[PDB]
Write a protein that binds this ligand. Structure first.
Ligand SMILES: Nc1ncnc2c1ncn2[C@@H]1O[C@H](COP(=O)(O)OP(=O)(O)NP(=O)(O)O)[C@@H](O)[C@H]1O
Lengths: 357, 23
């Protein structure tokens, strides 16, 4: 009668359908622990994420709703693919946990970052990453949380983006970015509390690319004031026109910082960190550097877009319209707009999403 | 046009939202 068995994985208990066998842990984050499993019906490995009592408070609820809604919309080879959504509880009153089942990838990007990548692999991985982002951007979705723990790869050299809990739909209203633990990849506009467009995500690609080359985090900060200082030290105090856009108190503190000059991008990414220079006229160290100097730009109105990035010669060698000009996700009549509902109401919203589609 | 890579080795061989809540 009972279609669920309950595995123990350290602290947390997974109660999952019988079809998913031999669960084992593969990763973790703010939302708990992720397991690999064998799906006896599809006869392949999958990934299984558990959201426990996500309706328990505001920030967990908004994050879960966004995840469910957007996992159902996305459809692209470089976005993690949704496979199943279920909950073991049988009614709304009893509802506790949501389980998301996804295709299984071999590792997240933190593993790749320590090793030395040649130019072919470095540019191909970024291209795939940019294609994933363009797909989100082609329906107005801004991810806001790109970072290496949110990108996964397979040993066949494919790459997929995941974790849309912070993703935002389109709108002309300011939305404060939710708190997160790993903040090293946030763009200046997010740090400083300014309005922002989709190429906040491009700044994050900039940090990731710098890391794949440095094998070290570009802007490590205990604090936000710490983090801003790392940015200006390395890139330089921004132009006075960029200072006007700031609110007064944020403005006074940023203008009172010591005026750093910033280093060149040759001084920031010398040939030594880059592999042997290809004979291919586009996969140069000088081209990867050029692309970095256009992504790692403090003032977003001066910063390259995802589309221009895909046309850049370091990336452009792999260009295929079936990947970079693919059909968008279909964003339903639901606003992921950081509104507030109460505990009782979030519970219904999240339950309906699990049971409907 | 160069062939896309098909293999990638994964193992080596060798409280506060913005900078305004702190001030
Ligand atoms: N489908 C998957 N395939 C492979 N690994 C995965 C998959 N989903 C999650 N992981 C792993 O589990 C970790 C947590 O993933 P995820 O939770 O989706 O993003 P996150 O921001 O890094 N943490 P979280 O706050 O829980 O969302 C990732 O860094 C991966 O190592």
């Amino acid at each position: 009668d009972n279609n669920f068995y309950s595995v123990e994985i350290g602290d947390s208990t997974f109660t999952v359908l019988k079809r998913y066998q031999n669960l084992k842990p593969i990763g973790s984050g703010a939302q708990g622990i992720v397991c690999a499993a064998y799906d006896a019906i599809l006869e392949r490995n999958v990934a299984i994420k558990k959201l426990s009592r996500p309706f328990q408070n505001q920030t967990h609820a908004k994050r879960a709703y966004r995840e469910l809604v957007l996992m159902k919309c996305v459809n692209h080879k470089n976005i993690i693919g949704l496979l199943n959504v279920f909950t073991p509880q049988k009614s709304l009153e009893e509802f506790q946990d949501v389980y998301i089942v996804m295709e299984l990838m071999d590792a997240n990007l933190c593993q790749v970052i320590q090793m030395e990548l040649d130019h072919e692999r470095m540019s191909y991985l970024l291209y795939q990453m940019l294609c994933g982002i363009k797909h989100l951007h082609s329906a107005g979705i801004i991810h806001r949380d790109l970072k290496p723990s949110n990108i996964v790869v397979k040993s066949d050299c494919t790459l997929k983006i995941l974790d849309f809990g912070l993703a935002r739909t389109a709108g002309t209203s300011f939305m404060m970015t939710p708190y997160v633990v790993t903040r090293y990849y946030r763009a200046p506009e997010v740090i400083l509390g300014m309005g922002y467009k989709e190429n906040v995500d491009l700044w994050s690609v900039g940090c990731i690319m710098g890391e794949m080359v440095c094998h070290k985090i570009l802007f490590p900060g205990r604090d936000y004031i710490d983090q801003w200082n790392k940015v200006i030290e390395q890139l330089g105090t921004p132009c006075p026109e960029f200072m006007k856009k700031l609110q007064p108190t944020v403005r006074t503190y940023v203008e009172n910082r010591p005026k750093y000059a910033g280093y060149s991008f040759e001084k920031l990414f010398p040939d030594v960190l880059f592999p042997a220079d290809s004979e291919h006229n586009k996969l140069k160290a000088s081209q990867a550097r050029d692309l970095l100097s256009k992504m790692l730009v403090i003032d977003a109105s001066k910063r390259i877009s995802v589309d221009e990035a895909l046309q850049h010669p370091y990336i452009n060698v792999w260009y295929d319209p079936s990947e970079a000009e693919a059909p968008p996700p279909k964003i339903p009549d639901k606003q992921l707009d950081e509104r507030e509902h109460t505990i009782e109401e979030w519970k219904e919203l999240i339950y309906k999403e699990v049971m409907d589609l | 046009r160069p062939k896309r890579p098909t293999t990638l080795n994964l193992f080596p061989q060798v409280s506060i939202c913005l900078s305004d809540e702190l001030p």
